[PDB]
Amino acid sequence: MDFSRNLYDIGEQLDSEDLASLKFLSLDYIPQRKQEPIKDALMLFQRLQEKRMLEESNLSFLKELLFRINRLDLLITYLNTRKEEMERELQTPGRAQISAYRVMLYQISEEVSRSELRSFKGGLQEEISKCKLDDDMNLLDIFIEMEKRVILGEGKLDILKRVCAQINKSLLKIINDYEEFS
C-alpha cells in the first residue's frame, strides 16, 4: 500500500487555501455537484481516481496540479521530479491537460490584495448586484459567478479587461500574453 501512503502524505501538507485552489483548477473535469461536498484532499484524490486521470502509472495530472500552485517542494520530496523536467514536459504543445484560460485566471487571482479585491468588487457593482458579491466571497468565487452569467469566458474578455484597467496594468499585460498564446 505504498502508493496510498504516498498520496496520503502528499494530501497531509495541503491547507484550506491550497485545497480551494485545487478545486478551482479542477473544474474542467469535476462538476459542481460532485465538488460541493469536497472538504479535504482525500475526496478530491478519490474523484480524480474515479475518472482514471490519476493512478499508480499516471501521475502527470497530479504533477501539473502541484506545479501550477507553486508547491515545488512536494514535487521533489515525494513524486521525485524537479522543476526543469516539469517545465520541459509542459512546454511541449498538446501535453497540458489544463487550458491556459484557467491558469491565467488563477494567476490573475493570485496577484490581487484585499484593497484591490474591494476595488474589483466595487467595479463589478454595475452588471452584478453588490449583495451577490459581498465581502464573504473571494476573487475565485467572483470569477465563477461571472462565468455563470456568460459575461466572462474563453471568447469574451472585454468586461474583465475594462474592470482590471482601473486597478492595474500589469494584469492587462498578463491578459495580453494569454492572447498572444492564442
Partner 1 sequence: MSAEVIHQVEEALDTDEKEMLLFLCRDVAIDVVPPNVRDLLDILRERGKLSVGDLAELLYRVRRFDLLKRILKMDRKAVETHLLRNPHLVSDYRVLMAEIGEDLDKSDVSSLIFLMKDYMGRGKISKEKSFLDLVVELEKLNLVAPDQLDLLEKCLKNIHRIDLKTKIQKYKQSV
Name the DSSP class of 101: H
In 3D space, the residue among 15, 74, 68 whose CA is nearest the CA of residue 40 turns out to be 15
Q: How far is the CB of 27 from partner 1 (least distance, A)?
A: 11
Whether 127 contacts 151, CB under 8 Å: yes
How many residues can be counted in the chain? 182
Tell me the H-state helices in 60-99: 60-68, 72-77, 83-91
The binder of 46, among its own copies, partner 1, none, by C-beta within 5 to 8 A per type, is: partner 1
Q: Binding to its own copies by residue 125, rule CB under 8 A?
A: no
Nearer to partner 1, 50 or 177 (CB): 50
Q: How far is the CB of 67 from partner 1 (least distance, A)?
A: 24
Site string for its own copies, 155-174 (x = CB under 8 A): --------------------
Q: How far is the CB of 73 from partner 1 (least distance, A)?
A: 19
